[PDB]
């Protein structure tokens, strides 16, 4: 049994993050047979970001972006895009120049219209905001801050809504699995924009966690005060990163272990709805180059072998489905 036909049966979505251009890897057959025997939604990794799908200010390409949404329909996988609104990876044309206000707010608002129109009923849920929290607890200084102020992420919700009233829009962030400064933030920020009739109808936590796990009792209560806001949740770029030394099969059960938990949790708050790994093989990931010193985070080994992991959360799976 596969890890969506199990996801199916709880009414759920199991899925990854494609890497670019995967349909012409030297091992794009594999790559694309473990994918679409074991998910049912996709995020492309980077393709459907700015610097791709917007290089030029008067010039949009979909041609990638639209390669992998051809491949989720053609295997039955819903989609989820990423991201609408970052601080990072942003073209020339947009670092390179010095903004004011109103020629902000109108570049962002033809950027999320023009994308979101693009693909509307075909992306089912949007990472509209990605990351705009410090890891102090305030807004991040990022240039649509800078330049205009709190608002840009109210009215990033207001127009991706206009041009898809069916998506759904969520905040996506890091490190905000736990109550913490940060999370407390994001929660005041959400229920202060709901309150105002804003179009959050969901949030992300990436889920880039490492073996030693989160503190599960902080995470079950946090997943609590965010579903009463009246929000679906949604895990989106998870990995747990282990050391690239020491006892690789310790490394590995502590793994298996932590994504065992991580399932149990998050399967027992029906306001989750879907988990995704931030890939899926550990020759594809972009950890190593993040977190030195660290990788093999995810699923499959480098020759696409199930882990330990991959067994555990399976059984998880299982005994939910059995229990129901």
């Known amino acids: 049994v596969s890890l969506r036909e199990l996801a199916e049966k709880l009414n759920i979505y199991i899925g990854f993050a494609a890497i670019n251009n995967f349909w012409s ?4 057959e594999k790559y694309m047979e473990v994918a679409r025997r074991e998910f049912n939604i996709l995020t492309p990794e980077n393709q459907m970001k700015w610097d791709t799908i917007h290089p030029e200010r008067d010039r949009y390409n979909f041609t990638p972006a639209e390669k992998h949404v051809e491949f989720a329909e053609e295997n039955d996988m819903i989609v ?3 991201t609408l609104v970052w ?11 010095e903004w004011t206000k109103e020629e902000l707010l109108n570049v962002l608002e033809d950027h999320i219209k023009t994308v979101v129109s693009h693909f509307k009923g075909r992306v089912k849920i949007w990472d509209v905001v ?4 410090s890891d102090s607890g305030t807004y991040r200084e990022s240039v649509w801050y800078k330049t205009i102020g709190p608002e840009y992420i109210e009215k990033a919700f207001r127009w991706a809504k206009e041009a898809d009233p069916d998506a759904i829009l969520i905040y996506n962030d890091y490190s905000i699995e736990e109550i913490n400064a940060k999370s407390n933030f994001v929660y005041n920020m ?3 924009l709901k309150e105002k009739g804003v179009p959050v109808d969901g949030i992300g936590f990436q889920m880039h966690i490492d073996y030693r796990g989160l503190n599960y009792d902080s995470f079950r209560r946090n997943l609590e005060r965010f579903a009463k806001l009246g929000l679906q949740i949604y895990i989106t770029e998870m ?3 282990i050391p690239l030394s020491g006892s690789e099969e310790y490394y590995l059960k502590k793994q298996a272990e932590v994504c065992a938990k991580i399932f149990d949790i998050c399967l027992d708050n029906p306001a989750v709805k879907a988990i995704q790994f931030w890939g899926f093989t550990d020759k594809y990931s972009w ?3 993040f977190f030195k010193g660290y990788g093999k985070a995810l699923l499959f080994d480098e020759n696409y072998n199930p882990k330990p992991c991959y067994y555990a959360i399976k059984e998880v799976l299982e005994k939910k489905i059995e229990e129901r």
């Open 25 to 28: 890897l030297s091992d794009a």
């Open 80 to 82: 989820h895009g990423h």
């Open 87 to 97: 601080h990072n990876q942003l073209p020339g044309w947009i670092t390179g120049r």
């Open 130 to 133: 990605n990351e705009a929290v």
């Open 190 to 192: 959400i229920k202060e």
């Open 239 to 241: 990995d747990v990163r």
């Open 287 to 289: 950890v190593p180059g």
